[PDB]
Design a protein around this ligand. Structure first.
Ligand code: POV
Ligand code: POV
Ligand code: POV
Ligand code: POV
Ligand code: POV
Ligand code: POV
Ligand SMILES: *[C@@H]1O[C@H](CO)[C@@H](O[C@@H]2O[C@H](CO)[C@@H](O)[C@H](O)[C@H]2NC(C)=O)[C@H](O)[C@H]1NC(C)=O
Ligand code: CLR
Ligand code: CA
Lengths: 1061, 256, 40
């Protein structure tokens, strides 16, 4: 009925892959051209697989351009990068098994890797059979995933079973071509293994030389079709190559005919007649008679008769003319090529075919490189394009590089960079805009760019659009340099070519190209962290939007790869030098919007990076802000309230560093005869007054202060709640309020201010975004809840009425829970208690599921119990709704914990519990017994099993989560007010004065920034090469490479055995 | 501002690894020896990696002992246990691929395992190209952890892009030596893969046999430097070895 | 006895056997190249 729904532009395999032009048919025999009868498909009778080979009969005067239109558009055949024309012997011939195997490996490898068409005679005999058999036992071995297109251009007057293919109407697309030959026809059948058929009519029958004209005119037609590519410089004309196995004089005529149309020829020696003659004619010597751009005519005084007799081996009538044609084909050294089995070891026939085309384009190296790009074969580029003989520059490789970038040829781009391309000269602004202009369509960036330039009505892409998209993919007030830097508006080169091409690579989701560009870059660690941020943020963008296709798991996996690379570079930097690696983490990076590597590693939630030893030691050093590493809590606690002891007993960073340097200067002797980050990571010294303010400014001293102040608050709030909270009466002084409660108001007001400034100092600059990120962590719910609950209690307090006063004191006496439970955050700075408090919140899910199942059993038993004990109307009916509803829930619940109401649920306790029905007196213990089996000795023991199962799994991850949360902890206490808990509110004012007047990083010198970039880059190189040597040295790869060398030994011995024989 | 704190005598890689002597320059052409204009470093245009190759132009009458003092002290170049002098053909020649591969395995393995200097002509043609290519595809394969020191002793009258390397003031340490040859000079360029350059002035231009004297007098100077060791018996004089690939009668004269 | 047993243990690991086998295969390949040179 209607079209079935396939996920278009999301998955690969659509169901389309699984009423005509002129198409004249001469059917009179003098000739009357009618519409064709034979143009469906052929299902060959059971040679393996389901393969329908479309065909078409057509007259000999049909123009080739229409046939190209029929192939490309109507048949849905892809535009090839190569065309292999296989000519040879019509009658069947024998190949030697080694050469046969080498032939059918070479031809199919060339066709599969290049993406080529193979044009042949079509019939079931001669060379066509060898090509068919090659295709058969290369598709039976590896399957049909890269389908090789074989075109059979045959004649209609010879093919068997014509009546089978004929139908006057339309719809011949099922056809059943049998293999049993019709008795007494004298004419070949079609080959089962060919993919497409062109059947040439002439009216006549039993005539062989009909398809010779159409073959040539088609081969002309696919030399002016341009190849498919994104660049307009990469679209070359399709190269054709000719392959020869045998034949008479006719193949040599065809060879010389097509050489004059600039088509090279490969002749296979170790085969039959014409190939061996032309080959052994080529095999003698070399001789340039005239210069003539390297011409050959191998006919000295010595070896004319040998060629005369070898031509005279077959055919006497016109030995001179065929010998003339044999010496004519050897004119151009570049055109003709001869493959012999005893030439080389490492040269297969596919290399002979492709190197013949490279030899055909020997004049211009640019054409050779374009062919090498078009085929996507870098071994040829390494072989005979980039040699010691010829030199490449930026100006010559510009077009090739742009083609390599736009068509996702990562290995070529790598190779051009490391040979003679310099990206400082190559990348201009127009090239970069052209790179973003030609994004694929199936990517995530294309909708985003279209939506951005859709608003504000701009028809042409520029770097302001790309900048704004990069800005909104990094939400924490990121500022891309495209929006501000003068080089990216519209000659001197761009500031960072490698970076912005790398950003283009990661935004297009090109894995190999991004890796190639990452390895040749200035800041590997920062780039990797920015990449992972971009990838996983656009992954979530792709996931939650309906008008963008879901490729989210691919983007998360790519983000994970860049996360591993960032950690690897950090690990190598840490192993070389532990101190300067921590300096490397706090560098103020200019190209990443003044943002440091630690902040980039927090923006993208990279737990593996923050959990690394270098980051953890750095966080401990930042926690000990400008203070000696082994200063204990009590020493700080004493010095916090006695600031005269601040100088003698507290050591500092300059003191220990001076001691270490003073020691290390002595070890070299012979044995005989707001500036906290600066003073942490420089050789700066502190006076007297500096090291007072630096002590109070340290996060750890603020933490110790916070703990002491918090203890004071809890004791104060516990006192007022337990001992002295009277009711308000206007008669007494102050309302009879104890000063304690006013001191409590003061401290709660201080906590309120702290939460206000915690809201105000968030990374986004939008009040909604501040609030949204403020309610990300679950502590702030408890904070604002407890503070709101407190303010409501104190508002209700003053009214002088017993009911709402009771409400006031109850609300305070329950708020103590939340203020005390809030202590667990100050307990979570510990190495041991911290991870445990993460493990608890991960077990809350299993507790929630347990309580749901328990609640179902509880309520079932409860309703049954109460119904049986106390009948619904009657003498024993308790006449009260609320106690009934609460009793159903109440008594089953307490009975879990061993509070069995055995006296109560039976006859006894008539006054306390209530008198029970006579039949309830014996039902109640029985129902209790069943309930106690299914609750205590089933569910509770099952809950123990659930917790032990999940504890190991959570144990692995909860530590990393604690490691990651240490950054927020340090950053929180870094920004807290300077002064101590008693005066902390006075300290808070100084932040208000600073704010009304209108950080963990260091700014390095240009020389130091250069030095740090060089050291980081060398560390990245060490990581990259170690990973290559790790992946190469695996046991499976050693065995595989060992197998390849054993095959090389076997081939060498075969050549030795050939040299013997 | 102040010096950044690195853990000295604890970890290996310090940031030091990552206002001159006489240094006469004949620039009149009869000769007036001025202070040199060309002594910074060369950032070659994008052949992989970040490698600044320091260089220096100097007159043909400069004493070799000062050049040794410049290498060992000023450039922070370690005292070698071997010196390989590669002489041969000036014009480009072809090696058979097995012998080519065997050559570039042997030379770099000897240099890496021994801890040696390789002294060559410096230019981008002949045997110097083979030594350069050897260093390139042995450092592209295994990285630069054991850096092979290749010294290019070339002449200043032949090298291309002289105006690129020249600066009257101090501070030429960033320099951008391009690979595209200037049209119609008739003289070679510097090799991208060499680590250090000594450029011999004579005042003249387009003359080849300028660096023959300095080459020998430097090779004399590093036969009397003692090797670094804790023992006073282990400090031997640095051995020099000569390696030949091709040449005319001139290489055989140099050999003898 | 302990020292030599540890040497024979570290040498007889699967990875070391495959690595040494690779070295002997390279020696065979070089010998055949010289045989092919002796033919030509
Ligand atoms: C009058 C009494 C004043 C007492 C002040 C205590 C000072 C606490 C700070 C402290 O000791 O630091 C400890 C850290 O580890 C922790 O802080 C883990 C949590 C324990 C501290 C909270 C104790 C309970 C008080 C709150 C209860 C709230 C109310 C609960 C109501 C139910 C130890 O630090 P350190 O090891 O010596 O540091 C040196 C090494 N380092 C720098 C490399 C790390
Ligand atoms: C054991 C583990 C402890 C766990 C914490 C236990 C929680 C409680 C501890 C925390 C709150 C602190 C309460 C004690 C301080 C008040 C003393 C007081 O009531 O004053 C009394 C005199 O002074 C008595 O010494 C006078 O009392 P008033 O007339 O009412 O004024
Ligand atoms: C009457 C009403 C009284 C209701 C009282 C219930 C008060 C409920 C309090 C809810 C807050 C707990 C979650 C805290 C949190 O933000 O998660 C953090 C982890 O937290 C942990 O470390 C584990 C927390 C377990 C506490 C379980 C509740 C305590 C009940 C005490 C029972 C006492 C008996 C009460 C009677 C992490 O957050 P994030 O990673 O940063 O995001
Ligand atoms: C956390 C628990 C909520 C704390 C809220 C605390 C704020 C409470 C403010 C209202 C207090 C009113 C008290 C009152 O008027 O007492 C009258 C008598 O009360 C009784 O005898 C019990 C009647 C049932 C009470 C409501 C259901 C309680 C269980 C369900 C409660 C849910 C008179
Ligand atoms: C109602 C209120 C009742 C009163 C309660 C008041 C109690 C007052 C408590 C006062 C004592 C506080 C001691 C804190 C120091 C802990 C030990 C320590 O140094 O931590 C170390 C670990 O130690 C474990 O191995 C290091 O910890 P880390 O560096 O963080 O890793
Ligand atoms: C107090 C009364 C006791 C019952 C109530 C208190 C028990 C805790 C309530 C849990 C709320 C749901 C919840 O958080 O999901 C949890 C899973 O559970 C589910 O996803 C099942 C969804 C049905 C929830 C309705 C249960 C009805 C309880 C009434 C049962 C019938 C009577 C876990 O969520 P998470 O996201 O995976 O982490
Ligand atoms: C609950 O109310 C019911 C109905 O008013 C009471 O049941 C009556 O109790 C009296 C006195 O024992 C009997 O004489 C009646 O026969 C009962 N009524 C019926 C319909 O059977 C019952 O007493 C009340 N229960 C409580 C605990 O107060
Ligand atoms: C643990 C195994 C053996 C199951 C035990 C089930 C027992 C505890 C259950 C099943 C039947 C129940 C009994 C059923 C009848 C009576 C008679 C009278 O006295 C009231 C309670 C009493 C005595 C019940 C007590 C609890 C009871 C005995
Ligand atoms: Ca808070």
């Amino acid at each position: 009925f209607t079209p079935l729904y396939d996920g278009g532009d999301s998955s690969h395999v659509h169901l389309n892959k699984f009423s005509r032009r002129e198409c004249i048919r001469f059917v009179p025999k003098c000739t009357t051209k009618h519409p064709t009868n034979a143009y469906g498909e052929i299902d060959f009778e059971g040679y393996g697989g389901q393969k329908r080979a479309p065909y078409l009969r057509m007259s000999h005067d049909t123009d080739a351009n229409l046939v190209i239109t029929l192939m490309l558009k109507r048949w849905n055949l892809e535009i090839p990068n190569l065309v292999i024309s296989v000519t040879g012997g019509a009658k069947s011939f024998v190949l030697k098994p080694r050469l046969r195997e080498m032939f059918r490996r070479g031809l199919i490898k060339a066709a599969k890797t290049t993406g080529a068409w193979i044009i042949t005679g079509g019939t079931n005999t001669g060379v066509m059979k060898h090509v068919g058999e090659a295709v058969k036992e290369q598709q039976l071995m590896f399957g049909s995933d890269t389908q090789v297109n074989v075109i059979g251009i045959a004649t209609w007057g010879i093919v068997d079973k014509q009546s089978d293919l004929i139908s006057e109407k339309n719809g011949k697309y099922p056809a059943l071509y049998s293999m049993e030959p019709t008795p007494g026809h004298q004419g070949a059948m079609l080959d089962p293994n060919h993919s497409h058929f062109f059947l040439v009519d002439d009216g006549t029958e039993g005539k062989y030389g009909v398809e010779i004209g159409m073959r040539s005119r088609i081969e002309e037609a696919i030399m002016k079709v341009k190849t498919d590519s994104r660049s307009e410089a990469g679209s070359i004309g399709v190269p054709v190559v000719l392959l020869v196995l045998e034949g008479g004089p006719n193949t040599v005529a065809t060879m010389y005919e097509l050489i004059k149309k600039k088509v090279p020829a490969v002749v296979i020696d170790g085969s039959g007649r014409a190939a061996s003659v032309v080959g052994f004619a080529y095999n003698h010597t070399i001789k340039r008679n005239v210069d003539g751009q390297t011409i050959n005519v191998i006919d000295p005084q010595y070896e004319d008769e040998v060629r005369a007799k070898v031509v005279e081996v077959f055919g006497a009538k016109g030995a001179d003319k065929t010998y003339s044609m044999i010496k004519d084909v050897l004119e151009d050294e570049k055109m003709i090529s001869v493959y012999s089995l005893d030439g080389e070891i490492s040269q297969d026939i596919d290399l002979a075919i492709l190197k013949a085309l490279l030899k055909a384009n020997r004049s211009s190296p640019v054409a050779q490189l374009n062919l090498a790009l078009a085929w996507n074969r870098i071994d040829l580029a390494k072989s005979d394009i980039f040699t010691e003989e010829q030199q490449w520059t930026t100006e010559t490789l510009s077009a090739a590089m742009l083609t390599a970038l736009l068509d996702d040829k990562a290995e070529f781009a790598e190779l051009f960079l490391q040979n003679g391309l310099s990206m400082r000269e190559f990348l201009s602004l127009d090239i970069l805009c052209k790179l973003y202009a030609e994004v694929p369509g199936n990517t995530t960036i294309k909708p985003l760019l279209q939506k951005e330039m859709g608003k504000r009505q701009v028809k042409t892409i520029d770097m302001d659009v790309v900048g704004e998209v990069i800005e909104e993919l990094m939400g924490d007030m990121f500022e891309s340099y495209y929006r501000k830097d003068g080089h990216y508006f519209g000659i001197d080169p761009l500031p960072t070519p490698y970076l912005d091409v790398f950003l283009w690579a990661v935004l297009c989701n090109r894995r190999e190209l991004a890796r190639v560009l990452w390895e040749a870059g200035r800041e590997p660690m920062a780039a990797a962290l920015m990449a992972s941020r971009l990838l996983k943020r656009m992954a979530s963008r792709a996931q939650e939007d309906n008008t963008i296709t879901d490729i989210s798991s691919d983007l998360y996996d790519h983000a994970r790869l860049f996360e591993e690379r960032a950690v690897g570079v950090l690990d190598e930097c840490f192993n070389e030098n532990e101190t300067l690696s921590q300096t490397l983490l706090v560098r103020e990076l200019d190209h990443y919007s003044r943002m440091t590597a630690l902040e980039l590693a927090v923006s993208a939630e990279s737990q593996d990076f923050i959990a690394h030893t270098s980051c953890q030691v750095l966080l401990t050093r930042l926690w000990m802000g400008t203070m000696a590493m082994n200063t204990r809590w009590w020493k700080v606690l004493v010095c916090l309230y006695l600031p005269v002891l601040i100088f003698p007993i507290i050591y500092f960073v300059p003191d220990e560093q001076h001691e270490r340097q003073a020691a290390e200067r002595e070890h070299q002797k012979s044995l005989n005869q707001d500036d906290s980050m600066e003073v942490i990571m420089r050789n700066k010294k502190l006076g007297f007054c500096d090291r007072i303010m630096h002590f109070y400014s340290a996060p750890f001293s603020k933490f110790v202060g916070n703990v002491v102040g918090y203890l004071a608050f809890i004791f104060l709030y516990a006192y007022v709640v337990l001992f002295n909270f009277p009711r308000f009466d206007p008669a007494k002084t102050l309302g009879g309020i104890h000063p304690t409660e006013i001191v409590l108001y003061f401290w709660v007001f201080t906590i309120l201010i702290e939460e206000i400034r915690q809201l105000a100092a968030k990374p986004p600059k939008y009040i909604k975004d501040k609030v949204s990120v403020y309610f990300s962590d679950t502590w702030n719910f408890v904070d604002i809840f407890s503070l709101t609950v407190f303010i409501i209690a104190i508002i209700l307090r003053f009214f002088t009425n017993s009911r709402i006063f009771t409400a006031s004191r109850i609300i305070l006496s329950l708020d103590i829970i939340f203020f005390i439970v809030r202590s667990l955050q100050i307990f979570s700075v510990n190495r041991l208690l911290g991870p445990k408090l993460v493990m608890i919140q991960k077990m809350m899910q299993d507790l929630a599921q347990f309580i749901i199942i328990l609640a179902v059993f509880t309520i079932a038993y409860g309703i049954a119990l109460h119904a049986v004990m106390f009948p619904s109307p009657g003498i024993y009916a308790r006449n009260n709704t609320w106690v009934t509803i609460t009793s159903v829930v109440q008594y089953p619940y307490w009975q879990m914990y061993g509070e069995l109401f055995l006296d109560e649920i039976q006859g006894e306790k008539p006054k306390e519990f209530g008198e029970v029905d006579p039949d309830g007196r014996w039902l109640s213990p029985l129902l209790l017994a069943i309930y106690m089996v299914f609750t205590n000795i089933l569910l509770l023991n099952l809950l123990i099993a659930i917790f032990n199962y999940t504890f190991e799994r959570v144990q692995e991850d909860s530590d990393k989560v604690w490691k990651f949360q240490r950054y927020d902890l340090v950053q929180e206490y870094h920004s807290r007010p300077v002064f101590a808990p008693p005066l902390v509110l006075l300290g808070h004012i100084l932040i208000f004065i600073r704010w009304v007047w209108r950080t963990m990083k260091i700014g390095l010198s240009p020389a130091e920034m250069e030095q740090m970039d060089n050291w980081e880059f060398q560390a990245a190189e060490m990581y990259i090469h170690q990973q290559q040597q790790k992946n190469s040295g695996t046991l499976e790869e050693r065995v595989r490479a060992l197998g390849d060398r054993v095959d090389c030994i076997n081939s060498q011995l075969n050549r030795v055995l050939d040299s013997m024989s």
